[PDB]
Write a protein that binds this ligand. Structure first.
Ligand SMILES: Cc1cc2nc3c(=O)[nH]c(=O)nc-3n(C[C@H](O)[C@H](O)[C@H](O)COP(=O)(O)OP(=O)(O)OC[C@H]3O[C@@H](n4cnc5c(N)ncnc54)[C@H](O)[C@@H]3O)c2cc1C
Ligand code: HEM
Ligand SMILES: O=C(Nc1cccc(Oc2c(F)c(F)c(F)c(F)c2F)c1)c1ccccc1C(F)(F)F
Ligand code: SF4
Ligand code: F3S
Ligand code: FES
Lengths: 129, 153, 250, 616
């Protein structure tokens, strides 16, 4: 019977009420541009590192691969490090881990260049097999 | 800092959790297609190449082992020649494909080649050339090394 | 006797501890229309009236009946049934949406995200409402071709893995392509503010050019092309042309 | 209301709108603009509404293609109505057509354009320049082949600014009446089973048509006459329901509409002898004659062994002679629909077509201000306090005996807006929201419960299919007094089988078995009232053709001169609106008749148009 309760409006997005104090200016535009421009600039740098080896290419690969992969994994991490599925703090801990990944990647590459054969050399040596 | 809709969207997802509603299947049910299989590959490769560089980089530093003994170890295993060029091809393909496909996806970011034929040409092309180049780079030295095993000179 | 078999995703929220499940249904193709909606209605009418789906038009214009048929996101009402009866066509809801019941997915985020692009004409110089037609040339209106046709069925967004993982923050192809549809509307004065709304790293930029959206679209449309077009505009690689000027006689 | 329990939720709104088609959203925009706390109740997401499926165009004398007058549009509207139409409502419509359509463009509606940058217009069926004297008119403003789709999406979008609050997928059960006065609507929320009572000062009924009453139609599955069932159950008699528009070119196998615009760009109909037969049935207008004429011409050609296809039981709309450039630019929607459903390349082949139930001139009666009315001989028109109605569900009556192509989308916006204008001006902030009666809506719940748990041995889908087959057979393009009478018999039987109803799904949550049976209830009311009104009209007018009463029966015989005749009394002639009043419990239907409003709103602005012999 109609002895029941007063109800509220269904949940609905008011796109004008959202405009009442939506200042934030945070263009990810330029960053998206460099990420792509940097990858475009790495197109020649792959065949280059095939034909010309050494300790200076080893350094250019390491600087370039580090900075590229840094952006790369940050993106993958944001697709699979979702607060919905992992909860808030663990998703921030996965985010932080992205930076650990970048910084450890470089450390381990510089080490391999300096105190071992180097990237371009290590490739030859598996190719010689 | 989220947009107002992104705040709204979050609450939505929470409301949905509250209602104990299932999520409709996706990966397990969606048709494999040249679209998302190749972007699937672009992510796999990019990540496996990262992973290798990190494991490889940090591994050979944290272990007392060096690269030269590691190369010597598997040589000492005296494994068949064809199988060794397969491992080389697997190493080379990810580099060839991801690089090639990377320019394809940059084209997509610029709205180039996004019609369905183009999509499917660039997919076969980029996938085809990658395989081609990886074969060339694995088989060219082995043709140059069998040119010394038996040879005119 | 040409008996086709359909596997249809089921879910009943009324039932306690209820789980989703696949249900097979046999259909005599010689007493049933040609499109998969016709099987769904037949099954509801003759076999099982608990079978639940959205539908309205018969001609693939309303968008009500989007769902996953034989792996792909399409419309039941214009999806030809697979004659080959040694196969069993599978029928699931739109991927990765919370479901209300059977093949009926909760659709209100999709609609909210649609609200957020402010899908309506805006003018910096206030116009007098009923009085006259705003000028727009043919070519300028033909930039709307391929854009205004969208029926808001959500096949494309529900096919997009980027959108599966981040519905709450990535806007997805259906909404983005509409966002673009007001951006290139010569008559609309608010390109700047519309682009501002999707400046952040997720809104538009989470489009990882997977291209599923443009493959699956049952109206043969191209969200992916609009999204690339949006990214250019966001990065300032391109800008919207200024509206052709309205002649003095007009 | 016994065998189960129901959660009930109360809301207080200024005005509740039932429907979000072209009309409902237009009203919503007007109200929210003007400050009102407006709710929009709709059984489907607004975009899915049938308006979205409209194709050909919307009529306005913009004179973008050649000079025009709205008074020419007024004429064609009235003539098309076969003088059953109310000229004051047709006046309001056509006067306001240029503004309304321009408003649409101003809302962002992406109309096709001409090289001068104005709104493109096509020719359409049953319109003319200079009062039937001049040539074939070009008033039909379009967005190619998808004019409705665009209009609705334009409107829906623009409604997200009026802060109008949407209750989506809420099935309306009944108007809440309090001593002859509507104080709101009660409804079932499909998502969560809850029953909702909306307290409102005004209620607008904008629910669309009842085309699913027939076996074959162009209408949506959702076109189940719910709004007129609402009005019936509220003790409101419905108007002109026997006037069912058969659109000439629906696809033969399926029902899918092919737009009149395809004829308006130079397409034509073709029989088996390879004749463009419309030059015989209509020498002046040909394949752009009025819908009721062309659909008959077709129906005869079948009857007389000139039908096409294996069974020789339909005809060809032939577009292939037109250039691909035009075919693609003006008719891309039907190109693809012909392809998908009839396996036809329209550039190379013809489309199999056949007269198909399409539009409903009849509905809830209103005055020219869109206010629902009751009628007696003694009292005359008497408004129902609080209730407005517009769109296809209504009968103003702007189409009378036959709707003119591209007048419905127009009708929906003009009077949709007109609702908001008329409420702004009659509603004042002094009058507060109606507190409900005690018990209000209790019966609608009782009905729900009974239908939800329905026991019987006749399933809801079966009883719907016989209703549809009956209607098709006994109330089609041509009708005879005995087939009708037998049809009325069989139909009043099917109204009994409602008591032997069988539903199966027992859930409250998104139960479409339940709702599709509430739709079957609502359809039976509409259909029953349709056929007995049809049985009783011993004349032929507009879409209602009687083989046994071929003539149009007016107060005078307008085939011969006027001076020297005796006006037949109301009771003898038929130029009068049918009013069907049904007891919803018993199913019994009475009749009555209400005069046609011949006068315009303002004779100073435009004269009325006396009846003549309708020829195209
Ligand atoms: C294929 C086709 C093409 C057409 N083309 C044209 C054209 O080109 N030009 C033209 O002028 N006319 C055309 N028409 C006619 C015209 O489109 C319709 O008559 C008009 O759009 C009706 O609009 P409406 O707002 O009255 O209701 P509709 O658009 O029919 O929508 C009705 C609304 O009411 C709601 N509703 C119904 N029942 C209930 C309930 N019980 N509870 C809650 N809500 C309910 C629905 O959810 C819906 O939103 C066409 C019709 C068809 C089939
Ligand atoms: C040589 C030319 C290269 C180009 C042009 C290139 C281009 C790109 C582009 C455009 C993307 C982003 C596409 C997207 O968002 O889905 C990307 C992602 C990535 N790249 Fe590269 N890349 C190159 C080489 C490399 C190399 C050598 C690595 C080595 C580890 C690498 C690792 C990655 C990773 C991890 C990602 C993230 C994957 C994803 O999110 O899908 N790339 N690359
Ligand atoms: O869907 C994409 N990969 C993908 C495909 C299949 C499985 C997969 O692992 C999962 C998974 F199985 C889960 F159950 C998860 F809960 C999860 F979090 C995953 F990550 C990722 C994908 C493919 C191409 C480009 C971009 C994507 C991306 F990034 F994610 F958007
Ligand atoms: S784009 Fe194609 S798919 Fe995505 S909504 Fe518009 S129509 Fe449906
Ligand atoms: S499917 Fe998804 S990520 Fe971009 S191009 Fe297509 S939207
Ligand atoms: S039911 Fe309208 S899109 Fe299929």
């Amino acid at each position: 019977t109609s002895a029941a309760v007063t109800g509220a409006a269904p949940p609905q997005f008011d796109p004008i009420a959202a405009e009442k104090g939506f200042k934030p200016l945070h263009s990810h535009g330029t960053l998206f541009k460099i990420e792509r421009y940097f990858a475009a600039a790495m197109v020649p740098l792959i065949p280059a590192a095939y034909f010309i080896h050494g300790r200076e290419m080893d350094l250019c690969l390491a600087l370039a691969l580090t900075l590229h992969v840094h952006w790369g994994v940050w993106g993958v991490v944001n697709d699979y490090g979702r607060p919905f599925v992992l909860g808030d703090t663990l998703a921030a801990a996965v985010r932080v881990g992205a930076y650990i990944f970048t910084a450890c990647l470089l450390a381990g590459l510089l080490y391999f260049n300096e105190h071992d054969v180097g990237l371009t050399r290590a490739f030859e040596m598996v190719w010689e097999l | 800092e989220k947009t107002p809709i992104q705040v709204w969207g979050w609450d939505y997802l929470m409301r949905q959790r509250a209602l104990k509603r299932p999520i409709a299947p996706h990966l397990t049910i969606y048709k494999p297609q040249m679209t998302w299989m190749v972007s699937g590959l672009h992510r796999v490769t990019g990540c496996a190449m990262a992973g290798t560089l990190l494991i490889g980089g940090v591994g050979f530093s944290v272990l007392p082992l060096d690269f030269t003994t590691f190369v010597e170890f598997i040589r000492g295993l005296g494994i068949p020649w064809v199988i060794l060029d397969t491992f080389k091809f697997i190493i080379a393909f990810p580099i060839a494909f991801h690089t090639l496909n990377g320019i394809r996806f940059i084209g997509f970011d610029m709205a180039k080649g996004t019609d369905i034929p183009s999509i499917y040409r660039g997919a076969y092309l980029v996938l085809g050339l990658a395989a081609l180049i990886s074969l060339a780079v694995v088989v060219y030295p082995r043709w140059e090394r069998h040119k010394k095993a038996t040879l005119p000179t | 006797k040409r008996i086709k078999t359909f596997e249809i995703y089921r879910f009943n929220p009324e039932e306690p501890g209820a789980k989703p499940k696949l249900q097979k249904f046999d259909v005599d193709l010689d007493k049933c229309g040609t499109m998969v909606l016709d099987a769904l209605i037949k099954i509801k009418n003759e076999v099982d009236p608990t079978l639940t789906f959205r539908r309205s038009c018969r001609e693939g214009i309303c968008g009500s009946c989007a769902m996953n048929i034989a792996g792909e996101n399409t419309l039941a009402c214009i999806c030809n049934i697979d004659q080959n009866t040694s196969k069993t066509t599978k029928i699931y809801p739109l991927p990765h949406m919370f479901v209300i019941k059977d093949l009926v997915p909760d659709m209100n985020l999709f609609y909210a995200q649609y609200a957020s692009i402010q899908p309506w004409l805006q003018k910096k110089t206030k116009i007098n409402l009923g009085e006259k037609q705003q000028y727009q040339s043919i070519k300028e209106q033909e930039k709307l071709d391929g854009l205004y046709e969208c029926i808001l069925c959500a096949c494309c967004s529900a096919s997009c893995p980027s959108y599966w993982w981040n519905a709450d923050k990535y806007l997805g192809p259906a909404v983005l392509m509409q966002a673009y549809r007001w951006i290139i509307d010569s008559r609309d004065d608010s390109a700047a503010e519309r682009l501002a709304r999707m400046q952040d790293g997720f809104s538009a930029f989470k489009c990882h050019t997977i291209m599923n959206c443009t493959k699956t679209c049952p109206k043969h449309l191209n969200p992916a092309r609009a999204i690339g077009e949006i990214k250019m505009l966001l990065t300032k690689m391109k800008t919207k042309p200024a509206p052709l000027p309205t002649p003095a006689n007009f | 209301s016994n065998i189960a329990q129901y959660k009930v939720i109360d809301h207080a709104y200024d005005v509740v709108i039932i429907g979000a088609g072209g009309a409902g959203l237009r009203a919503a925009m007007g109200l929210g603009e003007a400050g009102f706390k407006t709710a929009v109740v709709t059984k489907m997401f607004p975009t899915r509404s049938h308006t979205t499926a409209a194709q050909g165009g919307i009529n306005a004398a913009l004179g973008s293609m050649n000079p025009d007058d709205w008074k020419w549009h007024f004429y064609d509207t009235v003539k098309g109505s076969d003088w059953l139409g109310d000229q004051n409502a047709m006046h309001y419509l056509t006067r306001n057509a240029v503004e309304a359509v321009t408003e649409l463009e101003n809302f962002g509606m992406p109309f096709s354009r001409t090289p001068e940058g104005k709104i493109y217009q096509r020719s359409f069926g049953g319109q003319s320049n200079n009062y039937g004297k001049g040539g074939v008119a070009k008033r039909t403003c379009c967005v190619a082949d998808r004019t409705g789709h665009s209009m609705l999406h334009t409107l829906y979008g623009n409604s997200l600014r009026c802060h109008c609050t949407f209750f989506i997928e809420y099935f309306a059960l009944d108007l809440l009446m309090d001593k002859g006065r509507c104080v709101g609507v009660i409804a079932l929320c499909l998502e969560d089973g809850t029953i909702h009572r909306f307290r409102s000062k005004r209620t607008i009924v904008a629910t669309g048509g009842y085309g699913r009453a027939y076996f074959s139609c162009t209408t949506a599955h959702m076109n189940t006459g719910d709004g007129t069932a609402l009005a019936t159950r509220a003790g409101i008699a419905l108007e002109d329901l026997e006037f069912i528009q058969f659109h000439p070119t629906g696809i033969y196998g399926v029902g899918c509409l092919i737009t009149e615009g395809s004829r308006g760009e130079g397409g034509f109909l073709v029989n088996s002898e390879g004749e463009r037969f419309m030059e015989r049935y209509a020498p002046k207008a040909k394949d752009l004659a009025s819908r009721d004429v062309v659909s008959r011409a077709e129906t005869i050609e079948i009857m007389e062994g000139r039908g096409v296809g294996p069974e020789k039981d339909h005809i060809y709309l032939q577009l292939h002679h037109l250039p691909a450039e035009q075919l693609h630019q003006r008719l891309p929607g039907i190109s693809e629909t012909a392809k998908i459903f009839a396996g036809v390349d329209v550039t190379k082949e013809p489309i199999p077509v056949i007269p198909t139930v399409h539009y409903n001139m009849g509905g809830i009666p209103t005055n020219y201000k869109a206010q629902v009315i009751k009628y007696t001989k003694e009292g005359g028109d008497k408004i129902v306090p609080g209730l407005y109605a517009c769109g296809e569900c209504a009968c103003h009556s702007v189409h009378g005996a036959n709707r003119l192509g591209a007048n419905s989308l127009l009708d929906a916006v003009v009077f949709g807006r007109a609702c908001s204008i008329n409420i702004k001006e009659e509603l004042k902030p002094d009058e507060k929201i109606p507190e409900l009666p005690e018990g209000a809506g209790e019966e609608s719940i009782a009905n729900l419960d009974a239908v939800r748990y329905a026991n019987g041995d006749v399933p809801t889908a079966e009883l719907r299919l016989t209703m549809q087959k009956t209607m098709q057979k006994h109330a089609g393009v041509f009708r005879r007094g005995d087939i009708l009478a037998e049809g009325v018999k069989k139909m009043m039987d099917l109204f009994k089988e409602l008591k032997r109803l069988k539903t199966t799904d027992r859930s409250l949550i998104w139960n479409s078995d339940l709702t599709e049976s509430l739709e079957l209830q609502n359809l039976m009311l509409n259909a029953t009232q349709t056929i007995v009104a049809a049985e009783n009209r011993k004349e032929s007018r507009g879409a209602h053709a009687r083989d046994d009463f071929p003539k149009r029966e007016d107060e005078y015989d307008y085939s011969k001169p006027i001076e020297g005749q005796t006006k037949r009394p109301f009771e003898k002639h038929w130029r009068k609106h049918t009013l069907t009043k049904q007891d919803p419990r018993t199913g019994h239907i009475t009749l009555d008749y209400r005069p046609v409003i011949d006068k315009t709103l303002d004779p100073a602005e435009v004269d009325w148009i006396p009846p003549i012999i309708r020829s195209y």
